[PDB]
Amino acid sequence: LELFIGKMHKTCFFADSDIVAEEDPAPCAFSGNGRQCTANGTECRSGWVGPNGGITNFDNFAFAMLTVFQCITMEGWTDVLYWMNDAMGFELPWVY
Amino acid sequence: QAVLLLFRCATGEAWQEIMLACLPGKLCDPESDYNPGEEYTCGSNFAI
Amino acid sequence: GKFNFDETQTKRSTFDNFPQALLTVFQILTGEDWNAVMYDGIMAYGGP
Amino acid sequence: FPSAVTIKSWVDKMQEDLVTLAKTASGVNQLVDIYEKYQDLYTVEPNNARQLVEIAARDIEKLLSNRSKALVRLALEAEKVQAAHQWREDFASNEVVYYNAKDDEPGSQRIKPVFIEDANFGRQISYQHAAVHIPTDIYEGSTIVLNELNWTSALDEVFKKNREEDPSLLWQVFGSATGLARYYPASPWVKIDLYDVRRRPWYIQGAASPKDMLILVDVSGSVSGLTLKLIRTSVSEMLETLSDDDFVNVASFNSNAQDVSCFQHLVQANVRNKKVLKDAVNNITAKGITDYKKGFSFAFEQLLNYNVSRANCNKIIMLFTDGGEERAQEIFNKYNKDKKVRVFTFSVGQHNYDRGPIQWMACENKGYYYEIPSIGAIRINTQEYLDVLGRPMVLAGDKAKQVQWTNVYLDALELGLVITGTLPVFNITGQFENKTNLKNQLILGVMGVDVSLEDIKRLTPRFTLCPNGYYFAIDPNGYVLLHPNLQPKPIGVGIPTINSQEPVTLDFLDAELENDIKVEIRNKMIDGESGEKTFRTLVKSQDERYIDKGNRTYTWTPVNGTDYSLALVLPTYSFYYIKAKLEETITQARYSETLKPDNFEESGYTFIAPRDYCNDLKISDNNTEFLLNFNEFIDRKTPNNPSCNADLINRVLLDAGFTNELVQNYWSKQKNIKGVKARFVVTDGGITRVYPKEAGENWQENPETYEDSFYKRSLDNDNYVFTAPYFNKSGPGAYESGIMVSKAVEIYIQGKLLKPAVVGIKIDVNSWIENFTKRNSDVMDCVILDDGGFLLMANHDDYTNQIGRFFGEIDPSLMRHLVNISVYAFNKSYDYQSVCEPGAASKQSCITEQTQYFFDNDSKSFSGVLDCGNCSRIFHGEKLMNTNLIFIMVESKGTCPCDTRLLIQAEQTSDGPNPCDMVKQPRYRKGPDVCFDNNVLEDYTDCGGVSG
Numbered sequence A: 001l002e003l004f005i006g007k008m009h010k011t012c013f014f015a016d017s018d019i020v021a022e023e024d025p026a027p028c029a030f031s032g033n034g035r036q037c038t039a040n041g042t043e044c045r046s047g048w049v050g051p052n053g054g055i056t057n058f059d060n061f062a063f064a065m066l067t068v069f070q071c072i073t074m075e076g077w078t079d080v081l082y083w084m085n086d087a088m089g090f091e092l093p094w095v096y
Numbered sequence B: 001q002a003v004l005l006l007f008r009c010a011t012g013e014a015w016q017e018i019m020l021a022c023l024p025g026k027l028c029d030p031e032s033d034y035n036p037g038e039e040y041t042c043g044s045n046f047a048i
Numbered sequence C: 001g002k003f004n005f006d007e008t009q010t011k012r013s014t015f016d017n018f019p020q021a022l023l024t025v026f027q028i029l030t031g032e033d034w035n036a037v038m039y040d041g042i043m044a045y046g047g048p
Numbered sequence D: 001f002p003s004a005v006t007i008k009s010w011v012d013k014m015q016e017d018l019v020t021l022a023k024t025a026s027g028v029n030q031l032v033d034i035y036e037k038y039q040d041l042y043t044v045e046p047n048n049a050r051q052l053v054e055i056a057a058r059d060i061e062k063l064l065s066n067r068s069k070a071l072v073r074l075a076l077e078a079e080k081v082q083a084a085h086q087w088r089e090d091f092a093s094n095e096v097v098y099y100n101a102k103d104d105e106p107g108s109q110r111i112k113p114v115f116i117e118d119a120n121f122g123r124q125i126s127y128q129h130a131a132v133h134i135p136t137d138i139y140e141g142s143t144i145v146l147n148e149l150n151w152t153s154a155l156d157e158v159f160k161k162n163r164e165e166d167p168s169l170l171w172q173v174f175g176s177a178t179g180l181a182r183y184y185p186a187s188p189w190v191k192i193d194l195y196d197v198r199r200r201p202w203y204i205q206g207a208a209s210p211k212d213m214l215i216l217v218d219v220s221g222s223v224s225g226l227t228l229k230l231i232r233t234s235v236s237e238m239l240e241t242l243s244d245d246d247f248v249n250v251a252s253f254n255s256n257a258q259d260v261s262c263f264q265h266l267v268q269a270n271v272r273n274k275k276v277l278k279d280a281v282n283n284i285t286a287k288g289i290t291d292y293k294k295g296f297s298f299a300f301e302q303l304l305n306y307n308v309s310r311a312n313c314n315k316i317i318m319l320f321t322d323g324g325e326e327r328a329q330e331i332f333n334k335y336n337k338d339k340k341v342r343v344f345t346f347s348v349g350q351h352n353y354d355r356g357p358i359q360w361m362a363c364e365n366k367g368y369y370y371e372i373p374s375i376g377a378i379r380i381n382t383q384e385y386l387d388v389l390g391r392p393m394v395l396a397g398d399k400a401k402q403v404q405w406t407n408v409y410l411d412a413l414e415l416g417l418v419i420t421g422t423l424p425v426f427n428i429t430g431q432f433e434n435k436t437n438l439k440n441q442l443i444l445g446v447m448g449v450d451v452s453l454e455d456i457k458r459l460t461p462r463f464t465l466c467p468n469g470y471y472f473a474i475d476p477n478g479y480v481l482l483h484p485n486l487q488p489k490p491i492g493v494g495i496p497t498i499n500s501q502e503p504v505t506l507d508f509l510d511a512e513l514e515n516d517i518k519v520e521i522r523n524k525m526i527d528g529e530s531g532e533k534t535f536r537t538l539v540k541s542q543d544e545r546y547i548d549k550g551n552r553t554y555t556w557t558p559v560n561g562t563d564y565s566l567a568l569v570l571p572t573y574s575f576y577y578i579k580a581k582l583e584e585t586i587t588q589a590r591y592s593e594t595l596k597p598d599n600f601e602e603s604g605y606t607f608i609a610p611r612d613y614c615n616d617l618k619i620s621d622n623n624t625e626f627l628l629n630f631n632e633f634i635d636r637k638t639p640n641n642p643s644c645n646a647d648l649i650n651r652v653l654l655d656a657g658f659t660n661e662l663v664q665n666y667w668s669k670q671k672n673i674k675g676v677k678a679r680f681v682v683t684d685g686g687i688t689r690v691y692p693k694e695a696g697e698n699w700q701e702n703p704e705t706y707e708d709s710f711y712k713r714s715l716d717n718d719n720y721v722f723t724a725p726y727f728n729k730s731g732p733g734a735y736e737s738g739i740m741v742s743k744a745v746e747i748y749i750q751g752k753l754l755k756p757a758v759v760g761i762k763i764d765v766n767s768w769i770e771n772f773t774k775r776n777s778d779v780m781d782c783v784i785l786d787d788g789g790f791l792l793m794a795n796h797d798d799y800t801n802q803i804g805r806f807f808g809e810i811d812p813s814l815m816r817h818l819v820n821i822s823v824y825a826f827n828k829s830y831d832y833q834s835v836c837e838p839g840a841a842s843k844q845s846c847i848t849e850q851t852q853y854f855f856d857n858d859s860k861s862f863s864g865v866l867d868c869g870n871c872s873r874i875f876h877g878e879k880l881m882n883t884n885l886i887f888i889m890v891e892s893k894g895t896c897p898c899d900t901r902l903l904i905q906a907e908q909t910s911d912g913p914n915p916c917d918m919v920k921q922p923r924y925r926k927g928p929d930v931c932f933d934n935n936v937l938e939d940y941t942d943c944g945g946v947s948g
């Protein structure tokens, strides 16, 4: 919760529209640190439900409880890691 | 990055999917130095 | 019968009948993709 | 407030202040003198409304008899050639050669053609061979397709032979049941391609007879999810295979059977009714249990209604479900024990239910069984039911080989509005000895030949009639094959709210203004009986702003060739026309010299109508270069006109001398007038002239005389007509153009009335203000409106700024009161072909409501008091003599602080009329009298699942 909360909410939509550009969206950088969609007709801002439809995020204790327990069983723990290398840089999330 | 990939396979996440991605018929990044006229050459049958 | 919310694809790990529900519980028991079934169960009851 | 007597004199003074100026400056009586004093360069010929329609109908019938012979010559050869096919399964050695459209191979070799350009063909074509179109979803090079490319290669010789006999032949196409379409002449195919010949309206009508469908949609709980999205897309796709001759209704059942829409019975399945059904199908939800007995009883009862208009043909039920265990044997035994109704069943979605009962219903009732597991299966499975319906049609024999004609639709290869002849092709292999007879109950395909609407328009000339006279042809369904108001645009339905494969079916009552007397005329035309009728109509102007009343005469006869009926609308004062008779040299060469642009200084800026005099002179649609082409054509050519008619050329040349004699002898004497900014004459021949050559730059009228709105309004009216300038700065018209005034000339030769031309002037707006005042008063308002409530004069220097505007948009309180006190009437109409701005939920096509205002009463003095609430305004309206103007004087709107909603007279986007109550009293129509169903020799032993 402390290191990151609400970061996975910026996916790249099309320019002047509300349609997600790619079929399997991933977050952009929170503030210019992680991933930027370089597609020409797309730009990214806030207003995304989440990676797994909102199930997988750290923006609430109940959600943080569920995401961590998912990663302690070693099932779908790299997906949460890889969604952070997009939301933020490569330096912080790999340690966590 | 290579060490993290092996740690990914140690826990068994999608190690069979990574292996399929390393078969010979794969594209090579332009930064590498390869002879012209051949693009899908990198990748080896030793991935199995 | 509550896994019909997607309207764009057919879920295969469901609880539609006893033989299929018996395979899904076995799949969760082995721990493989147990979270993917859990997401469908959560989305079947409203969502996050 | 001035008394009625004194204000009557004031408006009386302006009457001859305007009429006398327009009577003298334009020279209305002087052009009449020119026409009457000669009476030797032209003759007055009768214009018989009965013989014209008789001649035109026979020419139209002969045109469709050219094509019927071509269709027979093509279908007859296709059956013979296909019957001698061996069906080999190896084409690698004996490769087939053909030209494939939309291109830049196991056993196929391609052809690279030459593609020379040609007239009456907006593309590049080649007569050396035929093109073959194969849909994307169909793989060329398979055994079925390659075997089809052999026996269809013999069609090219017949294709060439047909064109040799009739050079004026458009696309002739063979639509195969395998999918490929072969057409002549070869031309490259026109995003991705989604064309399938088997889903085209011209293919569908020849593949079967009309049908009374009733779609049952299973909306029980088990269909929720993906298999409901597939069902909704499947039902919408099957509605696309229906035309105006088929009657459909959609119903759903889940423990209770009910209609999904507002219709409650079978409806005509036109473009509007199908939109209602499609919208309702896309709004159904899945819930409850399944009850086939209640769902099939409801379906069978609706097919026995017979209060309503139906097709009286194939009665079929399409069941859209997934699976189940109910067979409903009792319902089928009770409702169709003699198998009068077919049942087609569909198993939609990815499920593992029981398909046994679903398959049993299919062939216990002479149907067929289909599976639609994914979106890719929707396109093909929803059109295969026409194979079953055509079984009794092939067993009929040669009595089913009748040529039919489609509705008006836009050609797929960008050719315009066309209609298509149709003829099915039968599989008669072994028919000589009748030994296989198993695959011979399916049609090989459908023949087709296209006829352009421009071809039909050439057989009905209109330049001998008044610009107010026209032809129009009708359909048994009531739609117009021919009409001035039919446009090459799709007809819209509803409101386009988003965040051309349908036919252009425009009804006769929607093409023009609907009347209680047109309905009985339309019904008399539909059942095919000749007649005539003279009666008073009210006619909408060319620009949808004005409505005027005039005598009209409708003369109609049936075309025995087809089911069409042709009528000619001819007003009074047009039963005679001027036919130029002059063959002398010098009297015609001088008239031609008046068309020279360098002579415009004294002869005025001269236009000429872009008419098809003959082929070697091509129109330009700008008149800047057409005049140069025209006048350098006549002199550089023999005057005898060896290859083309002199009637259309002698007429325009004759009127050149007449207009010149008016410009020179009268208009030149008065070089300038204070109240005149321009002087124009427009003639039936097709030339308009403006005396000040610099004033010809402000001419915005169509160079074609018959398409001039002010010309047509002047003929109907017996007095001067004032044309309001357009608003919203649509070009220069505010102050630098003037106010258009026109009056038709009337001549008498042997006691016969004729109206050959109109004359008029463009009154300067600035000069009119000075006379009107003799200003910006804050107490009293003085405005002048025309027939239609458009502002022309004012008394504020602020209303005058917004010139040519509907008076309801600048004074709604006063305008609305004038309607109620019966000064202005108004007819409202619907325009089904119009560009439409999308709204929130380029431009699309939708329906716009058109309203026009006109003088209701014949009285001239109007007075009263307007009670807007806690105030009072007194008015007095007087109408000027010998014109369509009205003068009204009111107090300033600032005295009473009320400003109600503004009265709008413009193109208002609408979605009406409501179709729920339209189907309760539908318009009269007559359906086809040939029905091919219920043949006892039909096999129907392959239920739907012989291979699974």
Ligand SMILES: *[C@@H]1O[C@H](CO)[C@@H](O[C@@H]2O[C@H](CO)[C@@H](O[C@@H]3O[C@H](CO)[C@@H](O[C@@H]4O[C@H](CO)[C@@H](O)[C@H](O)[C@H]4NC(C)=O)[C@H](O)[C@H]3NC(C)=O)[C@H](O)[C@H]2NC(C)=O)[C@H](O)[C@H]1NC(C)=O
Residues within 6 Å of the ligand: D086, D087, D088, D089, D427, D428, D429, D430, D436, D437, D438, D439, D440, D444
């Ligand atoms: C007009 O009607 C005539 C008959 O009235 C029809 O001619 C018949 O055409 C069929 C093929 O469409 C020929 O069928 C032969 O026999 C079988 C039937 O399929 C084929 O053998 C395999 O059968 C399996 C069945 O599951 C099939 O999947 C497979 O593709 C077939 N081929 C293989 C395995 O190579 C034969 O190959 C096929 N062809 C032969 C033997 O040459 C009939 O023999 C034809 N009958 C006659 C009297 O000619 C004709 O097609 C109809 N016209 C049109 C346009 O459809």
Ligand SMILES: *[C@@H]1O[C@H](CO)[C@@H](O[C@@H]2O[C@H](CO)[C@@H](O[C@@H]3O[C@H](CO)[C@@H](O)[C@H](O)[C@H]3NC(C)=O)[C@H](O)[C@H]2NC(C)=O)[C@H](O)[C@H]1NC(C)=O
Residues within 6 Å of the ligand: D081, D094, D095, D150, D151, D152, D153, D154
């Ligand atoms: C479907 O493909 C078939 C195979 O190509 C076509 O059949 C072949 O057409 C050739 C051209 O007419 C024939 O060549 C000549 O045919 C005449 C007529 O009987 C004969 O003199 C000889 O057979 C031949 N002449 C020579 C070789 O000098 C082929 O005989 C004929 N059959 C084959 C090749 O098996 C069909 O024409 C085509 N379908 C249609 C409808 O055209």
Ligand SMILES: *[C@@H]1O[C@H](CO)[C@@H](O[C@@H]2O[C@H](CO)[C@@H](O)[C@H](O)[C@H]2NC(C)=O)[C@H](O)[C@H]1NC(C)=O
Residues within 6 Å of the ligand: A040
């Ligand atoms: C995608 O990247 C850029 C656009 O972001 C394209 O390169 C040019 O970029 C300028 C700047 O906006 C445009 O005006 C040009 O139209 C672009 N195209 C040129 C010059 O050919 C780049 O080509 C795009 N890649 C594509 C379209 O494949």
Ligand SMILES: *[C@@H]1O[C@H](CO)[C@@H](O[C@@H]2O[C@H](CO)[C@@H](O)[C@H](O)[C@H]2NC(C)=O)[C@H](O)[C@H]1NC(C)=O
Residues within 6 Å of the ligand: D053, D054, D055, D057, D058, D557, D558, D559, D560
């Ligand atoms: C269509 O056929 C009818 C009848 O077959 C034609 O009617 C003829 O009308 C004229 C006078 O109007 C009569 O003198 C003839 O005797 C009628 N024909 C017959 C066979 O009796 C009608 O003219 C035909 N339509 C066209 C456009 O020619």
Ligand SMILES: *[C@@H]1O[C@H](CO)[C@@H](O[C@@H]2O[C@H](CO)[C@@H](O)[C@H](O)[C@H]2NC(C)=O)[C@H](O)[C@H]1NC(C)=O
Residues within 6 Å of the ligand: D305, D306, D307
């Ligand atoms: C129209 O169909 C109805 C049934 O759908 C027929 O039944 C009649 O309905 C009217 C209205 O109630 C009544 O006359 C009787 O109740 C019904 N029977 C008869 C014999 O009339 C009806 O006959 C059909 N035709 C008409 C003209 O209504």
Ligand SMILES: *[C@@H]1O[C@H](CO)[C@@H](O[C@@H]2O[C@H](CO)[C@@H](O)[C@H](O)[C@H]2NC(C)=O)[C@H](O)[C@H]1NC(C)=O
Residues within 6 Å of the ligand: D514, D515, D516, D825, D826, D827, D828
């Ligand atoms: C078009 O013309 C007028 C528009 O004002 C209307 O016809 C009149 O309608 C009123 C009200 O029903 C009648 O009292 C008049 O007798 C009608 N005028 C006639 C019959 O000349 C109506 O909107 C349209 N007229 C039609 C459809 O006939």
Ligand SMILES: *[C@@H]1O[C@H](CO)[C@@H](O)[C@H](O)[C@H]1NC(C)=O
Residues within 6 Å of the ligand: D059, D062, D063, D065, D066, D165, D166
């Ligand atoms: C075609 O129709 C015309 C009438 O339009 C007729 O004169 C002619 O005989 C018909 N046949 C041919 C081959 O032109």
Ligand SMILES: [Ca+2]
Residues within 6 Å of the ligand: A074, A075, A076, B012, B013, B014, C031, C032, C033
């Ligand atoms: Ca795993």
Ligand SMILES: [Ca+2]
Residues within 6 Å of the ligand: D220, D221, D222, D223, D289, D290
């Ligand atoms: Ca069910």
